[PDB]
Amino acid sequence: TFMRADEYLKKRATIGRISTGSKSLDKLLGGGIETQAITEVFGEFGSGKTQLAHTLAVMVQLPPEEGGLNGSVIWIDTENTFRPERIREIAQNRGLDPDEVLKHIYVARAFNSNHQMLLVQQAEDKIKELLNTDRPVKLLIVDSLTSHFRSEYIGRGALAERQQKLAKHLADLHRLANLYDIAVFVTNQVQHILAHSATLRVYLRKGKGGKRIARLIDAPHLPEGEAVFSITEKGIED
Amino acid sequence: TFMRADEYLKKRATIGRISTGSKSLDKLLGGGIETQAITEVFGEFGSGKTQLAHTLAVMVQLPPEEGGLNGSVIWIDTENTFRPERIREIAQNRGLDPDEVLKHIYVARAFNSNHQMLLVQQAEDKIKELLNTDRPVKLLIVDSLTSHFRSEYIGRGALAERQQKLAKHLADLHRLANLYDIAVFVTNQVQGHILAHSATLRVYLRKGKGGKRIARLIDAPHLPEGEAVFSITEKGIED
Amino acid sequence: TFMRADEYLKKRATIGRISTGSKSLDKLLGGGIETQAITEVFGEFGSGKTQLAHTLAVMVQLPPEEGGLNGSVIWIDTENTFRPERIREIAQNRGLDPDEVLKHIYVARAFNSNHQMLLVQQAEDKIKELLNTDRPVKLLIVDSLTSHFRSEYIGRGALAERQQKLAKHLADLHRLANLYDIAVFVTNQVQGHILAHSATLRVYLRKGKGGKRIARLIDAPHLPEGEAVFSITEKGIED
Amino acid sequence: TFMRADEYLKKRATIGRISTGSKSLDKLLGGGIETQAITEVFGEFGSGKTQLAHTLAVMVQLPPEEGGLNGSVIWIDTENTFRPERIREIAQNRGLDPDEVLKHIYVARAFNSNHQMLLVQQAEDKIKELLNTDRPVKLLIVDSLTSHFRSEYIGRGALAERQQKLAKHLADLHRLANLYDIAVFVTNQVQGHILAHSATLRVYLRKGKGGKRIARLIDAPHLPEGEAVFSITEKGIED
Amino acid sequence: TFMRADEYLKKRATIGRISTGSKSLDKLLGGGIETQAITEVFGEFGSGKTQLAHTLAVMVQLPPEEGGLNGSVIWIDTENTFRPERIREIAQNRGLDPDEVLKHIYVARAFNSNHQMLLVQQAEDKIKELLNTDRPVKLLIVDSLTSHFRSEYIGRGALAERQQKLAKHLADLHRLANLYDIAVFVTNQVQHILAHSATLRVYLRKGKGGKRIARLIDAPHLPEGEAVFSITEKGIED
Amino acid sequence: RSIEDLPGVGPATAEKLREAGYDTLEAIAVASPIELKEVAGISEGTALKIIQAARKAANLGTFMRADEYLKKRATIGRISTGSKSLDKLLGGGIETQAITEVFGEFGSGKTQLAHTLAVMVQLPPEEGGLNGSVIWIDTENTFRPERIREIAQNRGLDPDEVLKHIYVARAFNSNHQMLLVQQAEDKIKELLNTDRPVKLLIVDSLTSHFRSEYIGRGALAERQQKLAKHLADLHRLANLYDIAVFVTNQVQGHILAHSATLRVYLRKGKGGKRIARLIDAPHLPEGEAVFSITEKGIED
């Protein structure tokens, strides 16, 4: 069904924003990563996109004033890179209770493409039974989003099917994002494949001495420069 | 379906570690290959990855204080390379009862890819069978993991189903590793090259100076970034 | 299902060995071709691998001291090269009743790949029957093993399925080999050159010096290295 | 032939810097394009690299305190894009005498690669000619540098001679830049793609928001790692 | 002419060794880079091989006891990356006189392959008129050695000629190395082309947090591990 | 006429001809006036006279009566590898008047075998040598006079003495390599008619530089021609002076000495031991040989 541009405009206003935990980024990002959208972060291994994920898993928990959305987190881990113990750290280094955070984050290990996709659909369950609660789900992470797809589908003749499925997956996320005002954050290791339906794609690379530099890939809807930040306790900062 | 970050953090701390039988290799691995994980060791033929497998089949059996996890072993052999006589020897020189050790290792010969994949789904029963015991399964070996796949699936048009099924195999192993706190060890001969992408940790090892072998990681984060030397002798892996 | 390493040490303990009929080649094979294994012999046409097959079909029949295993023989013939007359000669030329040996050899002509695979599948029933008697099946020959496969499957987009079947075939043989302590001997003519990768052991042989042959192993793991010369005569193969 | 590390260190400190006419771009460049160097600016057609060239042809003329180096300009035009009227306008709005400025810029139209390369060797005389003056040559522009090369040398078998000669051209420029403390500025249109590899610094710039342009470097070490925005107006480049 | 294994053994003994300025390296290197040899260091851009060059340009100047050879330096710069001012720094941070160093280093900017090659042959001049002196040439750097070759020779049909010339160049260096007991250090940026005639090839990459890790590519004549070090004043250390 | 004692050739001319590879009577014998004219400067007509002189003077351009040839072969010496096993396989050891090529993967020990041979050849015939000197062309910087010292002082040989009958030259590229051959003939005749003439000439590696300087399908053609000539230059020395030529070839592009009198393949074996095998049936056995690397070089 098609809603009216009334409700539509209204909704696009009730769009929340999670802070990345680093001034410079939230800036170049126009607030931060938004809900009702899929934000894709991509770059070489070690470009810190999994750290950014961890940080976001904290930020979203704190009050709007600090850049959060007082919400829960659903984390689909495909590369076995989710470290709760990492949450604990960064957390007890920016106020919040380092043992409370790990109470509003729910993870699932995805062992292959089909598993990954099936988990997303089940994510609606935990998501659902929680909208009627003080801390609903506001962040849904898929790290990595492309990992399995680019390994199970090698050689043309599969590329077609790969996109079809990848697409159906992305579509499943988009739905959740809008259906529940959730911010969908996905990572993509690069050096190909992208998340075409992505609402916003941010590229980041290792920069200079122990620092990462981002830069959106678009033009309309947000700045056109670069943003530098670093990895420390508190996750990302600056 | 999902788990609370605190539970995951909890479950994780319950992760055991098997010693390779080498101070060195062990340091490199962070004390040894872990449970709830798939560790892939790969290298040229004769790089000693099958020895490492045999050693681990012993170590896991001894007490935590000694490097093991007082557990049993499920061994899926695809290249007919499992030698109990070699377990027995690694044991004998380690001061154990060869006759006992050989009672907590269970093998199955895998004659082809479909067989191999079938075996893994089958192990689940032996795991369950011993699970509620004092010596549950703690090590599951697949040697070789890639051997059959890289021989039954030739050329493109095949990679589609290969990875397709492989991925399904690795996923079967991952489940067991986590569902039962088991350490999954797999070997991969490397000169159509395959890989255990889903592998939790990939260790590369090659032959060295004289009779020695050297191992190195395939990741900078998590664990150091150096090399480890060791040797093959009675007791399996030393140094 | 699976099997305890100790009971495996048991199974492998009973590995028998058939003599090739020539001191030389046995040294190289460390005694002879073994049971619970697939031994592949390959070489150009006329390299004498079908003679080696005939000799083995006799030797396996005589006592362990004499180098046999007092066993019967199952022979899948795909190139119409099995000559019972030849067995008689080699047999009456080795302290064996010619007409009795032929009562412990069972042949089947394989007319194409599907037939061949279907025949090995049927061998089981025959194996099972003689399993309880004094002379069980101890030798299963497939000559040629690759012949039909490399003729019914031409061009890629076929080569892939060939392996998917050739592998199901080899797996069928491996099973019988272990399930019944049988030695599986297969031949492969070599000048698309397919091979029996699963081959527990691959022996290469070529026409040598003066009307003699010469064989060598392929690899390094388990068993010496070097070459072995022998000849074709009555008695089949002789040093 | 060679020089003492102290002399080189000395010669280097004698390196002048021309302002692009943009606080921003200037910061990004470390105060501006330097002498004794080849600065390559590249981007899509209309990214304003020819404007930047025109601005520099003015800036260089004014005092050091003002961003110039009180010098003359040698301009090798290959795409017939040099407009004195535009110099005159950039000057006029910068508070200078269009009639004067146009007296310290010397152009030559290059009709093809060989012509282009000839011109550079020729400039050396004008450089010498003005060298012992109070307003020596301090800026040498080649716009476009790659235009002709990427049109006269089509396909492989050509790249050999292209780069071969190009390299020889760039080397000719490098010499002049150092032999006479001149800043060499070259443009390169980018959608057989060429490049000034020997370039001392490569700056990439593209069109932006509205009428604006944005420049970024092609090196992490030496100078920052950010972007710079500016605009095209009278005075040439602003912001 | 062929010398006798007498003189030959003698010579291979009178082989000097320059320290890299970092314990860990000199170790994995069996002393350090030796004279009468071409040592090739290769790795990605920013792997610090030009720093290593700078350090070596200092070390070689100090007495044997500290790991030097009280010698001069000939530096062929092809990528305009030689910073005397960088020498000054590192120098006045490990004893020696930060303004004396730049007195025993002689540079030449090579603008292309032919220039590069021709400079090497002229290097014999400065080299020569200095052997009869307190501080003879002991280090000859070519940074980068491959830069120009891989740019002027693109597309097969040149690859052949490229190797021929590259070869003649390497041979020219080898000669100088032996003819004058000089240590030849050459860099090679990678991600192809190598310096085949190279006496020793060391690979180095950026490692962990602001550190570089080396590892020889051979087996016979020196260890088989890796070496970590860092870039600071003094150039390379650890 | 033996060397450039040819009619129209003076030293200056000889200079240009040598720096160009026309270093032998046969080299010139097979050239064309145009080539020599462009290499030396001489006129097309005198160059022609030069060619004819060479065609007529050529040593290896004459036939030998089989009775004479049977005898030449009767005087072929044999160097021991230092391994009963291997020698059996060679029927005594590598022979003189022949090019023996040993090839295998890096580390298959062919450079060790070279070092051993450089010692053996020095001891008496009964000891496994021919009381001779050694010319060593090193292209990969792998000649360690130290290993020589060792292997020598481990067979009761005076290392300080052994080191006095080995002459090395480092070859920095193909042209250098080829060039050093002609200069090898200089030293060979120098030490010729001496208590210890040259009996062993090593080229290690023989192919290294050729497979690096000639990359391409357009480079392949002349790659072979130059190797062909280089090999011919060695064959000549081998026969002209009863020398045993030993060359190594790393393998696994692809190259080899097609005109090698005998090609021996060797690979890393069991544990620390190497196994060498022959590549043909005519002349010599047909089995494998195992040996090891230790002091004394090669053993067993």
The token pair that represents D107 in the structure block: 């152009």
Cβ–Cβ < 8 Å for D138, D35:
yes
Q: Is D48 annotated as a binding residue?
A: yes
Element (H, E) at B108: strand B105-109
Q: Hey, what are F104's tokens?
A: 């295998």
Are B202 and B217 in contact by the 8 Å Cβ rule? The answer is yes
Residues of D in contact with E105 (CB under 8 A): 4-5
Q: Do chains B and C touch (3 or more CB pairs under 8 A)?
A: yes
Give the H or E element holding residue D120.
helix D113-131
State whether residue D84 is helix, strand or coil.
helix
Closest CA in chain F for residue E9? F145
- Mark the breaks in chain D: residue after which each occurs, C to N over 2.5 Å: 191
Closest in C3, C197, C219 to B107, CB measured? C3
Whole-angstrom distance between the N-terminal and C-terminal Cα of chain B? 43
Q: Measure CB to CB from residue C167 to each of B75, B152, B158 and give the nearest one.
A: B152
Structure token digits, residue F46? 């005198």
What is the separation, in whole angstroms, between the first and last Cα of chain E? 43
What is the rounded CA–CA span in Å between residue C78 and residue C110?
5
Distance CA E102, CA E97 (A): 9
Find the DSSP H helices in chain C.
5-13, 23-28, 49-59, 84-92, 98-101, 113-130, 149-152, 159-179
Which string of DSSP letters, residue by residue, matches A135-158?
Answer: S-EEEEEEESSSTTHHHHS-STTS
Provide the 8-state DSSP code for F128. Answer: T
Pairing of strands F262-268, F98-104: parallel
DSSP state of A29: T
CA angle, E74 then E78 then E80, to 5°: 95
Distance CA D170, CA F193 (A): 60
Nearest-Cα residue of chain B relative to residue E227: B226
Contact (Cβ atoms closer than 8 angstroms) between residue A124 and residue A176: yes
Contact D199, D39 (CB under 8 A): yes
Tell me the two tokens of residue F213: 């300087």
Measure the CA angle with vertex B233, ends B229 and B239; round to 5°. 30
Residue ranges and CATH numbers for the domains of chain D are 1-239 (3.40.50.300)
For residues A21 and A48, what is the distance between their CA atoms, to the nearest angstrom? 13
Q: Which residues of F make CB contacts under 8 Å with B?
A: 271-272
**Which residues are within 8 A (CB) of F174 and not within 5 positions of it... i.e. 6 or more apart?**
E167, F209, F210, F213, F214, F226
Q: Name the experimental technique.
A: X-ray
Query: How many CB atoms are closer than 10 A to CB B130?
Result: 19
- Strand partners of residue D203: D41
Rounded distance between C-alpha atoms, residue F130 and residue B53, angstroms: 53
In angstroms, the CA D10 to CA F192 distance is: 61
Q: Which structure tokens are listed for D160?
A: 């050999």
With beta carbons under 8 A apart, name residues in chain A contacting D227: 215, 224-226
Would you state the structure tokens that stand for residue D45, as one six-digit string?
Answer: 């057609």
Which residue among B80, B111, B157 places its CB closest to the CB of C171?
Answer: B111
Q: What is chain D's Cα-based Rg?
A: 17
| E101 DSSP assignment | G
Q: Is there a contact between F164 and E4 if contact means CB atoms under 8 Å apart?
A: yes
User: Helix, strand, or coil here: F15?
Assistant: helix
Shortest CB distance from C225 goes to which of F269, F281, F286? Answer: F269
Of B209, B220, B227, the CB nearest to E207: B220
* Cα D94 versus chain centre, distance: 20
Select from C36, C21, C60 the least CA-distant residue to C139: C60
C-alpha F28/C-alpha F39 separation (Å) is: 11
* Whether the Cβ atoms of residue B105 and residue B39 lie closer than 8 Å to each other: no
CB contact under 8 A, E109 and D5: no
Structure token digits, residue F257 = 């000495």
Residue C224 DSSP SS3? coil
d(CA D206, CA B12): 49
**Residues of F in Cβ contact (< 8 Å) with C227:** 286-288
Whether the Cβ atoms of residue F113 and residue F81 lie closer than 8 Å to each other:
yes
| Residue C29: φ, ψ to 5° | -85, 10
Q: Are E44 and E96 in contact (CB under 8 A)?
A: no
Cα separation, B16 vs A172, in Å, equals 37
Distance (Å, whole) CA A224 – CA D214: 9
Cα nearest neighbour of D221 on chain A: A208
Two tokens, residue F200: 């062993």
Beta pairing class for D37-43 and D201-207: parallel
How does strand D227-233 pair with strand D236-237?
antiparallel
Q: Return d(Cα F260, Cα F257) in angstroms, integer.
A: 5
Q: How far is CA F243 from CA A115, E70, F77, F237, in A?
A: 72, 46, 8, 7
**Residue reference for tokens 């209770």:** A97
Query: In terms of C-beta density within 10 A (0-12 exposed, 13-18 middle, 19 or more buried), how is residue F281 classed?
Result: exposed
Alpha-carbon gap, residue A100 to F68, rounded angstroms: 101
> In Å, how far is B76's CA from the nearest CA of chain F?
27
Q: Which residues pair with E4 in a beta bridge?
A: F167
For residues D188 and D167, what is the distance between their CA atoms, to the nearest angstrom?
15
Neighbors of chain F by Cβ distance (3+ pairs < 8 Å): B, C, E
Q: Which residues pair with D102 in a beta bridge?
A: none
Distance CA F118, CA F99 (A): 15
Chain B nearest C-alpha distance from F82 (Å): 22
Q: How far apart are CA D58 and CA D20, in angstroms?
A: 9
Q: How far apart are CA D140 and CA D185, in angstroms?
A: 6
- Cβ within 8 Å, pair B4-A103: yes
Q: Virtual CA dihedral for D174, D175, D177, D181, nearest 10 degrees?
A: 150
Q: Which residues of B touch E208 (CB under 8 A)?
A: 220, 225
* CB of F262 closer than 8 Å to CB of F255: no
CA C77/CA C84 separation, integer angstroms: 12
Chains E and C touch (3+ CB pairs under 8 A): no
In this complex, which of F146, F170, F187 lies closest to E178 when CB atoms are compared?
Answer: F170
Q: Determine whether the annotation assigns residue D113 to a binding site.
A: no
Backbone angles phi, psi at A67, to 5 degrees: 105, 20
Distance CA D236, CA C206 (A): 84
Cα F282 to its chain centre, rounded Å, is 22
The length of chain F in residues reads: 300
Distance between CA atoms of residues B106 and B124, nearest Å: 12
Transcribe F259-291 into DSSP letters. Answer: T-SEEEEEEE-TTSEEEEEES-SSSS--SEEEE
> Cβ(D53)–Cβ(D214) under 8 Å?
no
Distance from CA of B208 to the nearest CA of F (A): 11
Structure tokens at F147: 């290993």
Report d(CA A231, CA D75) in Å as an integer.
48
- The token duo for E11 is 């010579």
**Residue type present at position E70:** N
D129: which 2 tokens?
């000619």
From chain B, pick out residues whose CB is under 8 angstroms from the CB of A46.
Answer: 220-221
- Residue D78 near residue D110, CB atoms below 8 Å: yes
Query: Exposed e or buried b for every residue in F34-54, given b needs 16+ CB within 10 A?
Result: eebbebbebeeebbbbbbebb
Residues 6+ positions from C181 with CB-CB distance below 8 Å: C11, C14, C15, C16, C35, C36, C138
Give the best residue of E1, E2, E217 to mutate against chain F (max F CB count within 10 A): E2
Nearest CA to E184 among E196, E198, E205, E194?
Answer: E198
Quickly count: other Cβ atoms within 10 Å of residue F72's Cβ. 12
Report which DSSP code applies to E174.
H
Q: For chain B, how big is the Rg over CA atoms in Å?
A: 17
CA atoms of F28 and A111, how far apart (whole Å): 73
Contact B/D (≥3 CB pairs under 8 Å): no
CA distance to partner chain D, nearest, from residue E80 (Å): 7
Task: Give the phi and the psi of residue F270 in degrees, each rounded to 5.
Answer: 0, -100
Whether the CB-CB separation of C142 and C89 falls below 8 Å is answered with: no
- Residue in chain E lying closest to F219 (CA): E160
F99 to each of F89, F130, F134, F257, F267, how far by Cα in Å?
Answer: 16, 17, 15, 9, 20
DSSP letter for each residue of A207-220: ETTTEEEEEES-SS
Asked if C220 and F270 come within 8 Å (Cβ–Cβ), the reply is yes
The chain F residues in contact with chain C (CB within 8 A) are 269-270, 275, 281, 286-288, 290
Substitution target in E161, E166, E197, E224 with the highest count of F β-carbons within 10 Å is: E197
Q: What share of chain F is helix, strand, coil (3-state, %, to 5)?
A: 40, 20, 40
Residue E174 near residue E197, CB atoms below 8 Å: yes
Token pair of F194, please?
A: 């001496």
Report the residue numbers after which chain E has a gap, meaning the C atom sits over 2.5 angstroms from the next written residue's N, or none: 191
Instruction: List CB contacts of E11: < 8 A, sequence separation 6 or more.
Output: E3, E36
Tell me the CB-side half-sphere exposure of residue A132, using CA atoms within 13 A.
3
What is d(CA D200, CA D206) in angstroms, rounded to the nearest whole number? 20
Tokens of A170: 């992305």
Residues pairing with F292 in the sheet: F273, F299
Q: What is the DSSP string of E51-89?
A: HHHHHHHHHTTS-GGGT--S-EEEEEESSS---HHHHHH
Report which of A196, A74, A202, A198 is spatially closest to residue A142, judged by C-alpha positions: A74
> Do at least 3 CB pairs under 8 Å connect E with D?
yes
Chain D contact residues (CB < 8 Å to A): 208-209, 214, 216, 220, 225-227, 229
Closest by CA position to B23, among listed B11, B35, B31, B15: B31
D138: helix, strand or coil: strand
Buried b (16+ CB within 10 A) or exposed e, A182-214: bbbbbbbbbeebebeebbbbbbbbbbeeeebbb
- CB–CB contacts below 8 A, A to D: 23
Across the interface, whether the CB atoms of E225 and B225 are under 8 A apart is answered no
Kindly list the distances between the CA atom of residue D114 and the CA atoms of D76, D111, E218, F8, in Å, as whole numbers in the listed order: 13, 8, 47, 46
- Rounded CA separation C67/C17 (Å): 7
How many Å apart are CA A203 and CA E60, to the nearest integer?
A: 44
Q: What are phi and psi of A169, to 5 degrees?
A: -65, -60
Residues of D in contact with E122 (CB under 8 A): 1-2
List residues bridging with F289 in a β-sheet: F276
Closest residue in E to A209 (Cα) is E210
Secondary structure letter of residue E226 according to DSSP: -
Torsion of CA E183, E187, E192, E197, to 10 degrees: 0
> Is the CB of E5 less than 8 angstroms away from the CB of F170?
no
CB F76 within 8 A of CB F43: no
Q: Which residues pair with C203 in a beta bridge?
A: C41, C217
Residue C143, strand partner residues: C77
Q: Which residues, in sequence order, are bridge partners of residue A143?
A: A77
3-state DSSP assignment of residue B202: strand
